């Protein structure tokens, strides 16, 4: 019923990089996360380095200029606005978390897949196998796959 992007070419921009990770690893994690959803839809995502992107990717802590403060280490890991102009689509990651490429800390790739779900208009799944389940779970990110419920969800919006 809700907001959806009404175009197939979507842009994203990385506003700032967490110091927790190698810059190339931030780039690859977010890229790979967008690929997850483009693999099952007609959407295409392109990274831009200047200008206004649809989806601004931000690492920030506490109160950071929207109405939804972060809460320090623990609890909230990230949030994302649904499709829309301005802040719509934007995905914010709590810098008080310790972001990684692996099972330690909080995996940036897995969090971004979930956050980007929301940026594309998905809500939460009650299916504990689904990436859009509300609770973070680390799974070997090599071999990661969307569930049938996640696929049904995003195809209900875009496909
Ligand atoms: Ca936006
Ligand atoms: Ca937090
Ligand atoms: Ca951090
Ligand atoms: Zn925010
Ligand atoms: Zn969520």
Curated annotation (Swiss-Prot):
Which Gene Ontology molecular function entries are recorded, alphabetically? calcium ion binding; collagen binding; core promoter sequence-specific DNA binding; endopeptidase activity; metalloendopeptidase activity; sequence-specific DNA binding; serine-type endopeptidase activity; zinc ion binding
Residues noted as binding Zn(2+) 1 in the record, renumbered to the chain: 64, 66, 79, 92
GO annotation, biological process: bronchiole development; cellular response to virus; collagen catabolic process; elastin catabolic process; extracellular matrix disassembly; extracellular matrix organization; lung alveolus development; negative regulation of endothelial cell-matrix adhesion via fibronectin
User: Could you tell me in which tissues this protein is expressed?
Assistant: Found in alveolar macrophages but not in peripheral blood monocytes.
Question: At which positions is Ca(2+) 3 bound?
Answer: 71-72, 74, 76, 94, 97
* Residues involved in Ca(2+) 1 binding: 20, 95, 97
Where along this sequence does the record place binding of Ca(2+) 2? 54, 86, 88, 90
Active site annotation, chain numbering: 115
The highest taxon in the source lineage is Eukaryota
Task: Could you list this entry's UniProt keywords, alphabetically sorted.
Answer: Calcium, Disulfide bond, Extracellular matrix, Glycoprotein, Hydrolase, Metal-binding, Metalloprotease, Protease, Repeat, Secreted, Signal, Zinc, Zymogen
What name does this protein carry? Macrophage metalloelastase
Specify the species. Answer: Homo sapiens (Human)
């Amino acid at each position: 019923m809700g907001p959806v992007w009404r175009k197939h070419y979507i842009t994203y921009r990385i506003n700032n990089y967490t110091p927790d990770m190698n810059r190339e690893d931030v780039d690859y994690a977010i890229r790979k996360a967008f690929q997850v959803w483009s693999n099952v839809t007609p959407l295409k995502f392109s990274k831009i380095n200047t200008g206004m992107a649809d989806i601004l990717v931000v690492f920030a802590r506490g109160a950071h200029g929207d109405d939804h403060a972060f809460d320090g280490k623990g609890g909230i890991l990230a949030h994302a606005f649904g499709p829309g102009s301005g802040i719509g689509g934007d995905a914010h990651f709590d810098e008080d978390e310790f972001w990684t490429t692996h099972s330690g800390g909080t995996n940036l790739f897995l969090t971004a897949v979930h956050a980007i779900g929301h940026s594309l208009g998905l809500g939460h799944s009650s299916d504990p196998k689904a990436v859009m389940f509300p609770t973070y779970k680390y799974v070997d990110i090599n071999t990661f796959r969307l569930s049938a419920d996640d696929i049904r969800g995003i195809q209900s919006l875009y496909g």
